[PDB]
Paper text:
The two copper atoms in PHM, CuH, and CuM (located in the N- and C-subdomains, respectively), each use a single reducing equivalent from ascorbate to catalyze the reduction of molecular oxygen for the hydroxylation of the Cα of glycine at the carboxy-terminus of the peptide substrate.
Inclusion of 1–3 mM citrate, which produced crystals (H107A-PHM-cit) that diffracted to higher resolution, had unexpected effects on the structure of H107A-PHM and provided information about alternative conformations that can be adopted by this mutant. H107A-PHM-cit has two molecules in the asymmetric unit. Interestingly, the copper sites of these two molecules (A and D) present in the same unit cell have very different configurations, probably because citrate is only present in one of the molecules (molecule D). Citrate binds close to the empty site of CuH and interacts directly with H108 and H172; the carboxylate of the citrate partially occupies the space that in wild-type PHM forms the peptide binding site. Loss of coordination by H107 allows the CuH site to adopt a tetrahedral coordination by the inclusion of two water molecules, implying that square planar geometry at the H site is destabilized relative to the tetrahedral alternative. This observation strengthens the case for a functional requirement for a non-reactive open coordination site in CuH that allows electron transfer but prevents binding of small molecules that could modify the electrochemical potential of the copper.
Residue numbers in the entry: 50 to 354
Amino acid sequence: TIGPVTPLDASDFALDIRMPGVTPKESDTYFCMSMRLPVDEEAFVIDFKPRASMDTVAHMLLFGCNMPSSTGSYWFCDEGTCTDKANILYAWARNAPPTRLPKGVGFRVGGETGSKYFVLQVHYGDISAFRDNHKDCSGVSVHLTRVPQPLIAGMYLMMSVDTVIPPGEKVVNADISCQYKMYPMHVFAYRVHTHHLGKVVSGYRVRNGQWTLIGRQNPQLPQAFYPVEHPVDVTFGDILAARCVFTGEGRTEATHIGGTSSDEMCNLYIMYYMEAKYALSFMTCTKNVAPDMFRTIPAEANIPI
Ligand SMILES: [Cu+2]
Ligand SMILES: [Cu+2]
Ligand code: NI
């Protein structure tokens, strides 16, 4: 080994979270493994270094989850592994170099209310190179500290629950909105998720009837975290709003929200930071509290990228 925990700086350490020498049989194999945080006190994730085999690795995801495993182990996993409401800490996709965390920012783990386990999912797409039966140890090295950080990263997940897409309908809009009523968050990156019917997903902060884009992306592109130009402050009274556009073309019956590939999802993951003393690591919106606000949604919410 050397070990999974290594020192760095004065009072920091690194957790190498790798696959334990896997060799996948079929292509488009999803493997998971997990590791425990080696301290029980409050600590902060302040960086991620991808250690991926450009050969065969399509994507990696790191979740703050709560799935203990034996130190050798790995297993077949799918999208729902850490639920509905998965706390993604890091995504990596081939051909979408991800973005660093902003200076002073880290994810708050351990303690009485943080994650004690990290779960890593690695997608092996093209398995040409396992012709030869070598073991792959792809993954992420995570820079941890016990030194309090002034800014705390979190995730605001917007998702639709009761959308229905009729067969052959060229356009169905799944709309999501909630008023924001916390201390200020600063949005710096976003990720979108639909299945194959999704055409475009967009999210906005609306303040005083004025729409500010957070992000807009094709969900059929690599589902990584994309940066936000300038961060968007969201603040008490603001409304977060999102629209996924679906088509029914090429379907025979209606499509509902669900986990399988013949079902659909509309998820927008908004990654933010907050000042340490007011911070929440996770918020959720599953409602549409301001449906009529969508009269003024920019037209490009309905235009595929
Ligand atoms: Cu993938
Ligand atoms: Cu899904
Ligand atoms: Ni600025």
